[PDB]
């Protein structure tokens, strides 16, 4: 037992034993004869779970009596992992737990591999929203996570030939111990129908109505006896030839079915619309609801902040006015006052293909009234923008919430803009970018909007509970406060020169390595060399992330090998995981890819163990809890300019892996923390990216100059790394040559140089080591309470608090 | 007092005083009431050269006695700079003097700035034989320097309208107090006349005979009693209408009249062979009368070494020869086995210009005898290539000492193969270039004649004399063995977190800062920041030593400011010194440049005190003691391949200055010592500068892509930088985009993007400082007495040693 785990205490360790032996017993139904290892995980989870229970009712009923400005933060997204170690984490019940279930004769670790993900999200958007409810449950807030409970999440991912094989993720199966049902506070959500105009105000009539079924999951603060709510909706239809119409109820409650799998893309289909009402149509009732329990809606805006996350949640504006207006009969101008009060927008990225723009025809027939509030609110916008800019007509066509042209569409984030009293990206130079380039013309109208808040990552899910060894030497050294702040990991600068420190942080990832190598092999087959440099790149598969300028370097370094079979070369055992839309193409391609090259590179006697080549399979929360603690170095390669923030690259940081990267998003703050001489910068910087656009991208050059890269452009064409199909990589061979978006030959070479510069470090054990205590010392900054702090203080108004409520 | 000058000991401050005052009176023949600074300078080096004396003449006795290997050092250059000061430290008598000329009421730092300095030297090479002679003393071997004795050394630098103008150095004018004429010893030296054939042996009669007169001076070992000797030639006409015979007398001693002002550049004129020839045969007759005084000549390379500094002194190699066949009577084979082994080879540039190529008309009519001593040993060794390389006649061709074409000419370099068991480099990459390209096929033959030895330079001149406040506070920490052992500054590495160390070695950077920004107003009259980062280039004038893309750096920081004004930038001052070859218009048109900068920047009202660029005039030793202890940054920019060592790159590393420089020369070995991190290294690597040409060099190309590079070209061809002459850079600019031998352009972004990580360190005065610590802390290796040992160890057949000589 580690001391960050908590007490191990006599009277608590029978306490759970006996409630072990309960619910296995009355809840399982079940005997120690014929429980098998997943009624033991539930067992578990049920007996946890009465822990919260109680701090759950009062949390709920603190905020009932004291009345806080409340705060729901909207996402289509919840990309929250598993539950049952981050529970015992924030209640202090991991050692107790650990005993108890070894006094039954159980390995707890074994129980906890056994818990299905809660797989509700894409990535980097969705497991940001998992940090934050983590956050403001710790800062003691008085927070609401608000979404949909998609009956199947992100699809697993099986390597089939070397190809994804998507499967569908039916979390549910088993059931699901951590969630409540609250049949009793469903509500309904119209669609269709038509505007009617009478006499007194505008009626929404003869609409089609599903109802909303709430579920209702606890979220613990660090130990602080907080614990919030995240509900997620369900899609139910209502009770009212007989056959058919009982079957056909599917189609209504198809709305919570699955999780649109697209990340940064965005797909204008109606099912995904839906989702994108209901989840905002039942929240905001709720969120009224709970108002009038607290009517003047003056002082709305002092008792309610929104938060969309992204535009997914946006139609949560024009909702809003229209239950103002419509509903509770406020003038216009007041409406747009408290809405504009009460919301805010986070943008996540620039890319053109990522932007919500919804066709008029769409949003006309499936929400007409609606529809004719967003014309209202475009009117009132332009003619301040017509004010403002007395003249300048191009203006008004670029900040129009409505885009004209083959199919007129609503720019939904120019509608977040006009509605929301604070707009911020998610990284420094990300919202640098915004003002300057893609929000300009907004920014100018309206700069007092504009904010940045760097994203941040909970210290909770991604040190003390993935990496224990590495939690417990800090913590032996500076204590444990550092938790819940972050930022005292600084008092491990003075421990650099320390040489008992230098040499547990070497044994801490050493241990980490092992342990994954050992896994590697358990549940997948696959054996690789744990002194090797685990050089890793996991995060989901697009162009602009640049798995391909990796696989480049890859090739390269089995190139130089096959050159010079007898000269050293440090070992790598290099990691690229990630799962691909099902309707990428090219995403699919690259995987085939990575599969192929390791298919050559790996059976290559010469290479030996000195180059290995894994795709880790159906890369998730509970994989990257593995992997991430076991990396020496962490690839954070997109083009400069794309990467609006990234939170991987400060997962990496945080458990002692070196960084190799781009001035991109939130490495640049890294960077700056740590010291450009203890981060491998390289490539392009934005101003770099925008010469050669001026001047004209041209992939052909940079074949022509570099034999190495020339070289491995005509493996690829010739099949050497598909001798069965030689034609196998044209579609790619073809993009990098003629249309590469990314630039991915532009920073071949100082990627290559760069890396020969890790490679060196590594040779030099001690050195390597204590620029990673460099690293980690100066990760505080990215913590997700800090970013919580910002928003809180600065955008909603609001006071956090580390104050302990009673047992 | 500092501890490193020695011991003022009562007994001999008086003995001084006394010997001071008898040498004013007897010597000068002055008294107290006419006496001037000089005459007091001159009775001070009379009382510090008779403390030499006693120890000279044991010396010799000594060698006399023991009958050691000799060691002979040939070389057209001996650039010595002053003597007094480095006398006093060798004999450690420098407080102790300091001393006795304060009790007299007089400045000792005052009287030594009165000394000329011995410029008998251009540069690098000069300087190299100097370091050179004082390790050599220092370790105890039995050395002597052999050259010519020049009545005007290098030409003093006068600036005018901002142009280079030379005038004499007429350094002996006052007489020289150091030197003792031997004409006991002249020698005759034959030139012109013709070979006659009898029956036993050939005969070179009809000569005309000019005599080489020669004048010792004293070579003190560091604190070891050891004295050796440095013996220059003068010419001298011999004894036998009348008064012009009488003035022609001046023909034959204008040989040893004036240095070539040349550096790295052949210039084919008789009298420079005629100063060859001349130095060469007066020694060798003077190496053999020391031998025969110690006939079989099978033992003459176990007691005799010739080291050939370049090719200047390649003549020895057949003149040995001539000796050994024609006055010895040795058959030929017996002959070149002893030459061979007697004779070793050192290279200093790889450049085709600075190659020795004699044409053979001028040989045939000068020294006829050994064009065909010449002819026979060609003759010879092809055929050596012949057996060895059966058919390939183009190797024939390429390595035949011979050219061939429009003009024949005698390759020295491949004479000097032939004739030597050792070809030396002078730097690693130096070295190793020599093997793969200009000397290949040679290596080829015979791999075992090829080494390397990396450059140094004396750390009793360029350490404990020109910054004595540096060798103070280091002597402090760890004593003063380093001084004759430099390894023992990697001491100095446990102090790098030392934080008195650190604030002492700022202070004494800080301190030489200002005694020479004082120095620039006393005698030269320009006011300088003291605070800005002092950023200087100080060496000859050449276009492969890239002034010019200094130049750009300038006008870059220059164009940034005049663009934002109110932004803050790192002061600095811009110090770029060194002599053009009076023949060569693209140097003198690079200085003419880089005052018309000075002219623009230095009085723009909106610059002020953040930017200074001043040209340091009359660049000499002297000087270099000066300025190279009061730099910050050390520009060693040369193109990839060009520089084959380079030695003032080691004497600012020794100084506390960071370096900024490309992988050139010793460059190269110096960042391996410290560590790339502690270095700022930039630039196209020697394989770059290949890629480059195989591909072909367009400076075009980077014009066209880089914004600031283009508007600089533009400043210059619009006579922004010469109003009154819009046209007096064409050749720079013309020279710059059409036919740059060495890429300036290429380097450029890179340069600039790697001054702006300099200027950021800069702003951290403790990192800047403990950065410096790590260089100065592993600059032992370039102490040239590891060069020294190294010759002696593995080319001159001989053991160093650190014994004292009794008193
Ligand atoms: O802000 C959390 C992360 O959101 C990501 C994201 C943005 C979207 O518009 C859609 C999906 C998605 O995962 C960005 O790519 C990351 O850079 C950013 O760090
Ligand atoms: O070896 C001492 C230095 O000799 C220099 C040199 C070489 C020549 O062939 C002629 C003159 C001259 O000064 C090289 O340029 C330097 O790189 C080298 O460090
Ligand atoms: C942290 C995380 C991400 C985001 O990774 P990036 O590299 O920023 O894209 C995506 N997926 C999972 C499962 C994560 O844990
Ligand atoms: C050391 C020295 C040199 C050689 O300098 P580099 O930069 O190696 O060319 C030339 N001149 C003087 C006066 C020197 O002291």
Same mark, same amino acid.
């Given at each position: 037992?580690?001391?960050?785990?908590?007490?191990?205490?006599?009277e608590?360790?029978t306490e759970?034993?006996?409630?072990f032996?309960?619910?296995?017993?009355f809840?399982?139904?079940?005997?120690?004869?014929?429980?098998?290892?997943?009624?033991?995980?539930f067992?578990?989870?049920?007996?946890? #779970?009465?822990?919260?229970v109680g701090?759950?009712? @009062?949390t709920?009923?603190?905020?009932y009596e004291?009345?806080?400005?409340?705060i729901y933060?909207?996402?289509? *997204?919840?990309?929250?992992?598993?539950?049952?170690?981050?529970?015992?984490?924030?209640?202090?019940?991991?050692?107790?737990?650990?005993?108890?279930?070894?006094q039954?004769?159980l390995?707890?670790?074994?129980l906890? =591999?056994? =818990?299905?993900?809660?797989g509700?999200?894409?990535?980097?958007?969705?497991?940001?929203?998992?940090?934050?409810?983590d956050?403001?449950?710790?800062?003691?807030?008085?927070?609401?996570?608000?979404?949909?409970?998609?009956?199947?999440?992100?699809?697993?991912q099986?390597?089939?030939?070397?190809?994804?094989?998507?499967?569908?993720?039916?979390?549910l199966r088993?059931?699901?111990?951590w969630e409540?049902?609250?049949?009793?506070? !469903?509500?309904?959500?119209?669609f269709y129908?038509?505007?009617?105009?009478?006499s007194?105000?505008?009626?929404?009539?003869?609409?089609?109505?599903?109802?909303?079924?709430?579920?209702?999951?606890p &979220?613990?603060?660090? #130990?602080?006896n907080?614990?919030?709510?995240?509900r997620?909706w369900?899609?139910?239809?209502?009770?009212?030839?007989?056959?058919?119409?009982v079957?056909?109820?599917?189609?209504?409650?198809?709305?919570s079915?699955?999780?649109?799998?697209?990340?940064?893309?965005?797909?204008?289909?109606?099912?995904?619309?839906?989702?994108?009402?209901?989840?905002?149509?039942?929240? /905001?009732?709720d969120i009224?609801?709970?108002?009038?329990?607290?009517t003047?809606?003056?002082?709305?805006?002092?008792?309610?902040?929104?938060?969309?996350?992204?535009?997914?949640?946006?139609?949560?504006?024009?909702?809003?006015?229209r239950?103002?207006?419509?509903?509770?009969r406020?003038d216009?101008?007041?409406?747009?006052?408290?809405?504009?009060? !009460?919301?805010?927008?986070?943008?996540?990225? &620039?890319?053109?293909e990522?932007?919500?723009?919804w066709?008029?025809?769409?949003? *006309?027939?499936?929400?007409?009234?609606?529809?004719?509030?967003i014309?209202?609110?475009?009117?009132?916008?332009?003619? @301040? &923008?017509?004010?403002?800019?007395?003249?300048?007509?191009?203006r008004? #066509?670029?900040?129009? /919430?409505?885009?004209?042209?083959? &199919?007129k569409?609503?720019?939904?984030?120019?509608?977040?803009?006009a509605? $929301?009293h604070?707009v911020?990206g998610?990284?420094?130079?990300? $919202?640098e970018?915004?003002?300057?380039t893609?929000?300009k013309?907004?920014?100018?109208?309206?700069?007092?909007?504009?904010?940045?808040?760097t994203?941040?990552?909970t210290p @909770?899910?991604?040190?003390?509970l993935?990496?224990?060894?590495?939690?417990?030497?800090?913590?032996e050294?500076?204590?444990?406060?550092?938790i819940?702040?972050?930022?005292?990991?600084?008092?491990?600068?003075?421990?650099?020169?320390?040489?008992?420190?230098?040499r547990?942080?070497?044994?801490?990832?050493?241990?980490n390595?092992?342990?994954?190598?050992?896994?590697?092999?358990r549940?997948?087959?696959?054996?690789?060399?744990?002194? $090797?440099? %685990?050089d890793?790149?996991?995060?989901?598969?697009?162009?602009?992330?640049?798995?391909?300028?990796?696989?480049?370097?890859?090739?390269?370094?089995?190139?130089?090998?096959?050159? =010079?079979?007898?000269? %050293?070369?440090?070992?790598r055992?290099?990691?690229?995981?990630?799962?691909?839309?099902?309707?990428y193409?090219?995403a699919?391609?690259?995987?085939?890819?990575?599969?192929?090259?390791?298919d050559?590179?790996?059976?290559?006697?010469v290479?030996?163990?000195?180059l290995?080549?894994? %795709?880790?399979?159906?890369?998730?929360?509970?994989?990257?809890?593995?992997?991430?603690?076991?990396?020496?170095?962490?690839?954070?390669?997109?083009?400069?300019?794309?990467?609006?923030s990234?939170?991987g690259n400060?997962?990496f940081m945080?458990?002692?892996?070196?960084?190799?990267?781009?001035?991109?998003?939130?490495?640049?703050?890294?960077? =700056?923390?740590?010291?450009?001489?203890?981060?491998?910068?390289f490539?392009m910087?934005?101003?770099?990216?925008?010469?050669l656009?001026?001047?004209?991208?041209?992939?052909?050059?940079?074949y022509?100059?570099?034999?190495?890269?020339?070289?491995?452009?005509?493996?690829?064409?010739?099949?050497?790394?598909?001798?069965?199909?030689?034609?196998?990589?044209?579609?790619i061979?073809?993009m990098?040559?003629?249309?590469?978006?990314?630039?991915?030959?532009?920073d071949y070479?100082?990627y290559?140089?760069?890396? *020969?510069?890790?490679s060196?470090?590594?040779?030099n054990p001690?050195?390597?080591?204590?620029?990673?205590?460099?690293?980690?010392a100066?990760?505080?900054? %990215?913590?997700?309470?800090?970013?919580?702090?910002?928003?809180? #203080?600065?955008?909603?108004?609001?006071?956090?608090?580390r104050?302990?409520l009673?047992?």
């Amino acid at each position: 037992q580690i001391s960050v785990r908590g007490l191990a205490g006599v009277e608590n360790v029978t306490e759970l034993k006996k409630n072990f032996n309960r619910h296995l017993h009355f809840t399982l139904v079940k005997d120690r004869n014929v429980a098998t290892p997943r009624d033991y995980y539930f067992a578990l989870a049920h007996t946890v #779970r009465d822990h919260l229970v109680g701090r759950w009712i @009062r949390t709920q009923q603190h905020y009932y009596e004291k009345d806080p400005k409340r705060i729901y933060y909207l996402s289509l *997204e919840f990309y929250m992992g598993r539950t049952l170690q981050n529970t015992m984490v924030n209640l202090a019940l991991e050692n107790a737990c650990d005993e108890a279930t070894y006094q039954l004769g159980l390995d707890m670790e074994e129980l906890e =591999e056994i =818990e299905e993900d809660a797989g509700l999200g894409n990535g980097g958007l969705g497991r940001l929203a998992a940090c934050f409810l983590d956050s403001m449950a710790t800062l003691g807030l008085a927070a609401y996570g608000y979404g949909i409970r998609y009956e199947f999440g992100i699809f697993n991912q099986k390597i089939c030939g070397g190809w994804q094989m998507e499967e569908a993720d039916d979390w549910l199966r088993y059931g699901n111990p951590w969630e409540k049902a609250r049949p009793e506070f !469903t509500l309904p959500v119209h669609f269709y129908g038509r505007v009617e105009h009478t006499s007194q105000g505008a009626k929404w009539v003869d609409t089609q109505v599903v109802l909303a079924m709430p579920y209702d999951t606890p &979220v613990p603060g660090y #130990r602080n006896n907080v614990v919030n709510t995240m509900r997620l909706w369900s899609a139910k239809a209502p009770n009212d030839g007989y056959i058919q119409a009982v079957l056909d109820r599917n189609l209504a409650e198809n709305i919570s079915r699955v999780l649109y799998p697209n990340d940064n893309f965005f797909e204008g289909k109606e099912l995904r619309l839906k989702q994108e009402y209901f989840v905002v149509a039942a929240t /905001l009732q709720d969120i009224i609801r709970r108002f009038k329990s607290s009517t003047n809606f003056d002082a709305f805006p002092d008792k309610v902040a929104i938060q969309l996350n992204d535009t997914h949640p946006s139609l949560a504006i024009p909702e809003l006015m229209r239950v103002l207006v419509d509903l509770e009969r406020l003038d216009w101008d007041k409406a747009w006052e408290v809405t504009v009060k !009460t919301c805010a927008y986070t943008n996540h990225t &620039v890319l053109p293909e990522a932007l919500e723009r919804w066709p008029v025809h769409l949003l *006309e027939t499936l929400l007409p009234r609606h529809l004719q509030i967003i014309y209202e609110i475009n009117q009132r916008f332009l003619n @301040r &923008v017509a004010a403002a800019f007395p003249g300048d007509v191009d203006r008004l #066509r670029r900040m129009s /919430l409505v885009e004209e042209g083959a &199919v007129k569409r609503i720019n939904m984030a120019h509608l977040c803009i006009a509605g $929301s009293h604070a707009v911020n990206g998610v990284a420094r130079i990300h $919202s640098e970018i915004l003002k300057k380039t893609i929000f300009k013309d907004f920014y100018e109208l309206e700069p007092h909007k504009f904010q940045n808040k760097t994203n941040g990552i909970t210290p @909770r899910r991604w040190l003390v509970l993935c990496n224990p060894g590495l939690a417990e030497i800090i913590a032996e050294r500076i204590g444990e406060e550092y938790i819940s702040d972050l930022d005292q990991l600084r008092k491990l600068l003075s421990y650099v020169d320390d040489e008992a420190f230098i040499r547990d942080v070497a044994k801490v990832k050493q241990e980490n390595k092992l342990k994954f190598a050992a896994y590697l092999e358990r549940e997948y087959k696959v054996h690789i060399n744990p002194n $090797s440099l %685990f050089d890793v790149q996991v995060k989901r598969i697009h162009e602009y992330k640049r798995q391909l300028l990796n696989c480049l370097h890859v090739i390269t370094l089995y190139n130089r090998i096959k050159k =010079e079979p007898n000269k %050293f070369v440090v070992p790598r055992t290099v990691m690229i995981g990630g799962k691909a839309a099902p309707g990428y193409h090219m995403a699919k391609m690259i995987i085939k890819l990575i599969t192929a090259i390791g298919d050559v590179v790996n059976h290559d006697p010469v290479v030996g163990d000195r180059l290995r080549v894994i %795709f880790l399979e159906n890369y998730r929360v509970s994989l990257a809890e593995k992997v991430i603690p076991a990396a020496d170095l962490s690839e954070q390669i997109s083009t400069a300019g794309t990467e609006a923030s990234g939170t991987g690259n400060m997962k990496f940081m945080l458990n002692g892996a070196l960084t190799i990267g781009t001035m991109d998003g939130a490495n640049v703050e890294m960077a =700056e923390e740590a010291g450009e001489e203890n981060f491998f910068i390289f490539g392009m910087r934005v101003e770099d990216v925008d010469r050669l656009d001026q001047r004209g991208y041209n992939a052909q050059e940079y074949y022509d100059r570099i034999p190495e890269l020339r070289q491995i452009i005509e493996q690829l064409s010739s099949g050497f790394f598909s001798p069965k199909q030689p034609d196998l990589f044209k579609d790619i061979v073809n993009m990098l040559m003629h249309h590469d978006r990314f630039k991915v030959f532009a920073d071949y070479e100082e990627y290559v140089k760069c890396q *020969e510069r890790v490679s060196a470090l590594y040779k030099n054990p001690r050195e390597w080591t204590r620029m990673v205590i460099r690293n980690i010392a100066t990760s505080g900054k %990215f913590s997700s309470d800090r970013t919580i702090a910002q928003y809180a #203080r600065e955008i909603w108004g609001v006071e956090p608090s580390r104050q302990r409520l009673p047992a």
